[PDB]
């Protein structure tokens, strides 16, 4: 016949952030029983005020920058076509949705919770003998 034999980056690309739904992991953090590395109090808040406190996504993505800056000893900056969205549309996602540093933008979503889990999604017990071994 014919076969492509083509290498793919997208199949090796991580898709963890696509199905990652935030309210599902908030159950995880209570049921993990590991500690979770909360920062200090005044180390959170943004500009003496105006910018709402910190998202826990925000102390993650800013941590990703500091982990990147300490490796390469250099800084990244005001590069404009990315900044005009990702500072406008992101800091308005704060004031529209975050309240006291905790996100309430989850709850107005049409992204439904089922489509991540979906009765384990793939590798599903579609036959009868598959159902006996999950009982095993």
């Amino acid at each position: 016949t014919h076969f492509e034999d083509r290498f793919d980056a997208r199949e090796h690309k991580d898709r963890s952030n696509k199905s990652r739904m935030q309210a599902m992991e908030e159950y995880i953090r209570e049921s993990s029983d590991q500690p979770d590395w909360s920062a200090s109090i005044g180390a959170d808040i943004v500009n003496h005020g105006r910018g709402g406190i910190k998202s826990l996504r925000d102390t993650e993505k800013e941590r990703r920058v500091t982990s990147f800056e300490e490796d390469n000893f250099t800084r990244l900056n005001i590069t404009n076509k990315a900044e005009k969205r990702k500072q406008k549309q992101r800091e308005r996602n704060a004031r529209m949705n975050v309240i006291g540093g905790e996100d309430f933008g989850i709850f107005s979503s049409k992204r439904k919770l089922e489509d991540s889990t979906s009765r384990r999604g793939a590798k599903k017990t579609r036959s009868a003998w598959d159902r006996a071994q999950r009982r095993l």
């Binding site: 076969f3 492509e4 034999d5 083509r6 290498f7 990147f68 490796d71 390469n72 000893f73 990244l76």
Partner: protein
């Protein structure tokens, strides 16, 4: 920017293009990505230039001073500082991997012959994948075999004929870059020979005969594969 460089999308717009050289450009990893970007030895692009002009780095027994110098699969990259020797080896997930080796292992490399003919005045010659053509080889050395290279001279100290049931690395295709030591060799239309591969978990995988690189016998590989 390609997949196997492990660059971030951050830190600057343009990707550092490779120079023409021994390896294929899509197979190549330039030395600018090798020093300041993955091994984190330098910070700026100019700092790569100061390392090369002072001749700290030597690749495969040559001085090799070029910023975008193409380094490829199975390349002994010897750094005179630290007395440490580096050998590039591809990683299963889609990327390259810098690897520590010894001084004796920095002496030899392996090389896939791509084409063998009869040169002028009745001289046999084989042409490796790194473009190292060598006069007077063994006539046992034929197409797709590996060649152990001395690197003090251009001489051939060991040779391994392609036979089914020997530990094979893949260079190309979808299932590029695993162990799996052979199932057999398939014939097909247009060539397109699919040298089948069954891994440590004994699962069939299919790439082209062009992608086949024999890295050892069933059991022993000739080089120190990175264990992890």
């Amino acid at each position: 920017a390609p997949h196997h460089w492990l660059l971030d999308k951050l830190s600057g717009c343009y990707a550092p293009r490779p120079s023409a050289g021994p390896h294929k450009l899509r197979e190549s990893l330039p030395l600018i990505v090798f020093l300041r970007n993955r091994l984190k030895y330098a910070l700026n692009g100019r700092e790569v230039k100061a390392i090369l002009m002072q001749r700290h780095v030597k690749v495969d027994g040559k001085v090799r001073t070029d910023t975008t110098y193409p380094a490829g699969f199975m390349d002994v990259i010897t750094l005179d500082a630290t007395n440490e020797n580096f050998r590039l080896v591809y990683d299963v997930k889609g990327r390259f991997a810098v690897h520590r080796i010894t001084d004796e292992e920095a002496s030899y490399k392996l090389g896939k012959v791509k084409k063998v003919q009869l040169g002028k005045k009745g001289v046999p010659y084989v042409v490796t994948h790194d473009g190292r053509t060598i006069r007077y080889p063994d006539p046992n050395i034929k197409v797709n075999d590996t060649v152990k290279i001395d690197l003090a001279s251009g001489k051939i100290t060991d040779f391994i004929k392609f036979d089914a049931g020997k530990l094979v690395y893949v260079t190309g295709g979808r299932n590029l870059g695993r162990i799996g030591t052979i199932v057999h060799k398939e014939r097909h239309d247009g060539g397109f020979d699919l040298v089948h591969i069954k891994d440590s978990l004994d699962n069939t995988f299919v790439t082209r005969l062009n992608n086949v690189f024999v890295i050892g016998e069933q059991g022993k590989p000739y080089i120190s594969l990175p264990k992890g």
